[PDB]
């Protein structure tokens, strides 16, 4: 009945080479958890004008897994050590950072004894508290590195949760989901949370060439601490699925033209599309950063520290 779409492109210069970028919005401002290894640092940065400003270095005195959680007035970032997958400790040691602003944090080492994810693959990600009844949870989820036709336990994904802002992780959140594929490799499991609804974004491969296919599963409560997950098909011919977010209660999905991502397409509710055409560079690494139910950013890094920021406004009545 009424559709509004507005796009804007801006640039951010970074004076730090980040091997991995983790964007988040805190108090209506853009931040980045920059992993820099040349010499290792985990800088917290903030968009000020046309540049990234380094506020802190959480690696002052300790490559770890980063689980950042943005609450209304707080930022809880955990840096967890991970040893070789096949020589792991039974207890996980993390460093918990707490802040009411963006600059100053307090470091506290924590231990997650007999943690349930010893046999799971963990990846770094930014997330939100998931409200289950009257409790707010922070989720650390992992997936089996491989799924085989003869798997004993058929639930590849598992979550451990904290409802004390990240101090203890004694809550287990069962995730009911078995990949359609009989034998599959998993990568970069990241939970997507919007309006107290749980979802997962991940990649699936088969050790062929260097193929990784994005998969997205939407989950529904079965019990308070149990979810049933299932595949959400966003497949498009001659377009490779890249990122998923939600604006206006609908999915906003980005795709590349091919696996080399020369250009990207953004589809709003699979009805309307815009084309992102990147000097000469691609949109590899393109990521949505939701601002509100009508605004989001689409960020990918060109050159070294040139971040192309696509500000998207979308409304549908």
């Amino acid at each position: 009945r009424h559709v509004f779409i507005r796009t804007e492109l801006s640039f951010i210069k970074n004076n730090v080479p980040c091997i991995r970028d983790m964007f988040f919005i805190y108090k209506r401002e853009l931040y980045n958890i920059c992993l820099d290894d040349l010499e290792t640092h985990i800088y917290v940065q903030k968009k000020v004008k046309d540049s990234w400003i380094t506020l802190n270095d959480l690696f002052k005195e300790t490559r770890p897994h980063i689980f950042a959680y943005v609450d209304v007035e707080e930022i809880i970032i955990l840096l967890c050590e991970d040893e070789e997958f096949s020589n792991r400790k039974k207890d996980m040691t993390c460093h918990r950072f707490y802040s009411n602003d963006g600059k100053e944090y307090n470091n506290a080492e924590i231990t997650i004894s007999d943690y349930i994810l010893k046999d799971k693959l963990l990846s770094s990600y930014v997330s939100l508290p998931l409200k289950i009844e009257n409790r707010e949870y922070f989720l650390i989820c992992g997936v089996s590195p491989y799924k085989f036709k003869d798997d004993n336990k058929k639930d590849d994904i598992l979550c451990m949760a904290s409802h004390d802002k990240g101090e203890t992780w004694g809550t287990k959140i069962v995730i009911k989901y078995d990949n359609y594929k009989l034998g599959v490799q998993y990568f970069f499991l990241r939970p997507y949370i919007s309006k107290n609804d749980l979802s997962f974004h991940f990649y699936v491969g088969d050790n062929i060439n260097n193929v990784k296919n994005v998969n997205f599963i939407e989950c529904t409560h079965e019990k308070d601490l149990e979810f049933v997950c299932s595949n959400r098909d966003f497949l498009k011919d001659n377009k490779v699925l890249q990122d998923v977010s939600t604006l206006n209660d609908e999915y906003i999905v980005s795709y590349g033209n091919d696996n080399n991502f020369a250009e990207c397409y953004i589809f709003f509710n699979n009805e309307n599309s815009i084309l992102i055409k990147p000097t000469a560079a691609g949109c590899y690494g393109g990521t949505f950063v939701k601002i509100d139910e009508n605004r989001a950013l689409f960020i990918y890094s060109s050159s070294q520290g040139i971040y192309n920021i696509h500000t998207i406004y979308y409304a549908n009545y």
Partner: antibody
Framework: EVQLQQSGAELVKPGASVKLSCTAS????????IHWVKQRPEQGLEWIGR????????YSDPKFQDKATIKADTSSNTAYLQLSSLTSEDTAVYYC?????????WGAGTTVTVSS | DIVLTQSPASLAVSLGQRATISCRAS??????????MHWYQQKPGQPPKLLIS???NLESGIPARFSGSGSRTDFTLTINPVEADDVATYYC????????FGGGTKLEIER
């Protein structure tokens, strides 16, 4: 009962093209990856490539030319190997196999013979 | 690419003896606790049949006289004791990086 039935033996004049069929029974090709292996008489096994029938993604070995196009149709539960412009160096038994991170289900083979 | 070499090219053993076929990989074939090295048996005029998957996993229906061992780049198939219907060519194959097969090892029975 899991299975992979391959097409019947066929003559193929040099330079002409052929399309073999690999049809599943007991499983859906969509939930797996169908591979092709070439075996010349008195020779070993030579991996050709694979189709991921869920998305249509295909990969053939670089050394093995792009003279083999892997195709699939999930509604018929069939995968295809299209070998074009075949020479006598293409006279071999072509096997199709299902991959679950190892080849657990095999096809009986199609004898491809280039016939002058 | 991961290149597979089998030793020996052929084996001559008697019924009841132990036969060990080795497979050496140019790169490590291990990933997240799994060794992606599998063994097949091919009898003339028939397709290869999966015997062992993931280095040591004996496939359902395959006799316990077939066993596999191996760590990163070095793997072994053991047939013990060898029986008359074990005459075949044995191939090793990896699925860690693309798919590659070993040369083959012909098993002949001495009687």
């Amino acid at each position: 009962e899991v299975q992979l039935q391959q097409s019947g033996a066929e003559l193929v004049k040099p330079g002409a093209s052929v399309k073999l069929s690999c049809t599943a029974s007991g499983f859906n090709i969509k939930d797996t990856y169908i591979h092709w292996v070439k075996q010349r008489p008195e020779q070993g096994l030579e991996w050709i490539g694979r189709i991921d029938p869920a998305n249509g993604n295909t990969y053939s070995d670089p050394k093995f030319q792009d003279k083999a196009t892997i195709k699939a149709d999930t509604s018929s539960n069939t995968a295809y190997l299209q070998l074009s412009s075949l020479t006598s160096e293409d006279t071999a038994v072509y096997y199709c196999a299902r991959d679950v991170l190892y080849f657990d289900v095999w096809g009986a083979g199609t004898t491809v013979t280039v016939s002058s | 690419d991961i290149v597979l070499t089998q030793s020996p090219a052929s084996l001559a053993v008697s019924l009841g003896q132990r036969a060990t076929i080795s497979c050496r990989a140019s790169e490590s074939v291990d990933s997240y606790g799994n060794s992606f090295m599998h063994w097949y048996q091919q009898k003339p005029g028939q397709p290869p049949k999966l015997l062992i998957s993931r280095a040591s996993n004996l496939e359902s229906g395959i006799p316990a006289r077939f066993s596999g061992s191996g760590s990163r780049t070095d793997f072994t198939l053991t047939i013990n004791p060898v029986e008359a219907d074990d005459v075949a060519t044995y191939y090793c194959q990896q699925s860690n990086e693309d798919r590659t097969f070993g040369g083959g090892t012909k098993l002949e029975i001495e009687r």
